[PDB]
Amino acid sequence: TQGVITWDPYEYNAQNTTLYTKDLRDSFKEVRYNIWRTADGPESKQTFTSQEKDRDFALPLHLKTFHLKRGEFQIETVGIKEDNTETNLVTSKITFQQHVPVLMYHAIEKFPGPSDGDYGLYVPPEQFEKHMQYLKDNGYTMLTFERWNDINRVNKPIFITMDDGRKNNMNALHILQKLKDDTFQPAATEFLTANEIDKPNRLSTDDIKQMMDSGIFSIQSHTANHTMMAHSNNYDEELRGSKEKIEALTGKKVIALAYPVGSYNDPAVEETKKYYEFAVTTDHGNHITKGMPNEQYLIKRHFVGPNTSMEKFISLIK
């Protein structure tokens, strides 16, 4: 209950910092740091002692000691005076941002086409189950934006997203429901294009109530009319109106957007910012929180489709 823990600024992808303890009224000869990874968690713990003083008990921390695993780390400090008595100083948290892949699916059906959409949109149910089982077999934690803050608090975080709200997405629910067990708790996000709800080949209101009632799905916005936002300025109908339509259906808060076609620019982000906490793109790559401005409205996603080999799929979620 005494003092405060500070550290040296680092960049998002850095592996090292020097953290030091400050503002103690009593005078100490050394400080002991008890540090552990929130995910692993307290049972895994490592102690480092800074006999180093004059420089506020600086400690050079490098993730190599933690095997370069990343995320949130907890720090407990205890001060040892000239008399060898011990005093509990303060608890802190330091975070080293972790990469999170976000997979973009669309239809979970065998291609019947052309019909609705191109072949690239249609992952057969068997392929999708193989992906989901792989995440089950390799200890992935599936997250949605209600749990955004946990990416640095869990092992192997991953977001599984689906765009458009196509009716064959109920096959995805069943696939997830059947893999649901005491060990594996699945979560996914569905982005509805609002004005297509209860249209042919789109999820029904009952479809959504079911997906919502399983505890697996987060229901979010895909715009009202699958509009390309960089080329539109009807923000009100497409951003705000879409959100309120879904919200009036679900009864749950809508906080995330997925730009149709991946189309966006600065004015559309500034307008998205007014109505959403997160927005997701089709920009290729993993997501990392780098500290960039508005970066939570430009989240990078991976395209997964019928021609995605398992080997490549695996390379994506590495």
List residues near Zn ion by CB under 5 A.
163-164, 260
Residues 6+ apart with CB under 8 A from 200: none
Which is nearest to 180 in space by CA: 217, 131, 148, 216? 216
Question: In angstroms, what is the minimal distance from the CB of 234 to Zn ion?
Answer: 17
Q: What DSSP string describes 188-232?
A: EEEEE-GGGTTSTTB--HHHHHHHHHTT-EEEEE--SS---GGG-
- Judged by beta carbon, residue 164 or residue 238, the one nearer Zn ion is 164
Residue environment code for 179-189, b if the CB has 16+ CB neighbours within 10 A, otherwise e = beeeebebbbb
The binding site comprises 164, 222, 226
Question: In angstroms, what is the minimal distance from the CB of 282 to Zn ion?
Answer: 9
- Judged by beta carbon, residue 152 or residue 168, the one nearer Zn ion is 168
- Judged by beta carbon, residue 79 or residue 262, the one nearer Zn ion is 262
Nearest residue to Zn ion on Cβ basis: 163
Bridge-based pairing state of the strands 16-22 and 4-7: antiparallel
- Judged by beta carbon, residue 35 or residue 246, the one nearer Zn ion is 246
Question: In angstroms, what is the minimal distance from the CB of 207 to Zn ion?
Answer: 17
Question: In angstroms, what is the minimal distance from the CB of 226 to Zn ion?
Answer: 6
Question: In angstroms, what is the minimal distance from the CB of 286 to Zn ion?
Answer: 21
Which is nearest to 218 in space by CA: 185, 182, 192, 248? 192
The binding site for Zn(2+) comprises 164, 222, 226
Cis omega before residue 41 (within 30°)? Answer: yes
- Judged by beta carbon, residue 48 or residue 303, the one nearer Zn ion is 303
Q: CA-CA distances (angstroms) from residue 160 to 53, 163, 168?
A: 48, 10, 16
- Judged by beta carbon, residue 5 or residue 257, the one nearer Zn ion is 257
User: What is the C-alpha to C-alpha distance for residues 1 and 26, in angstroms, rounded to an integer?
Assistant: 12
> CB-hemisphere CA count at 13 Å for 69?
19
Question: In angstroms, what is the minimal distance from the CB of 232 to Zn ion?
Answer: 14
Which residue type occupies 317? Answer: I
Bridge-based pairing state of the strands 59-62 and 256-258: unpaired
User: What is the C-alpha to C-alpha distance for residues 96 and 68, in angstroms, rounded to an integer?
Assistant: 10
User: What is the C-alpha to C-alpha distance for residues 254 and 279, in angstroms, rounded to an integer?
Assistant: 11
- Judged by beta carbon, residue 36 or residue 259, the one nearer Zn ion is 259
CB distance 72 to 186 below 8 Å = no
Which is nearest to 196 in space by CA: 217, 231, 169? 169
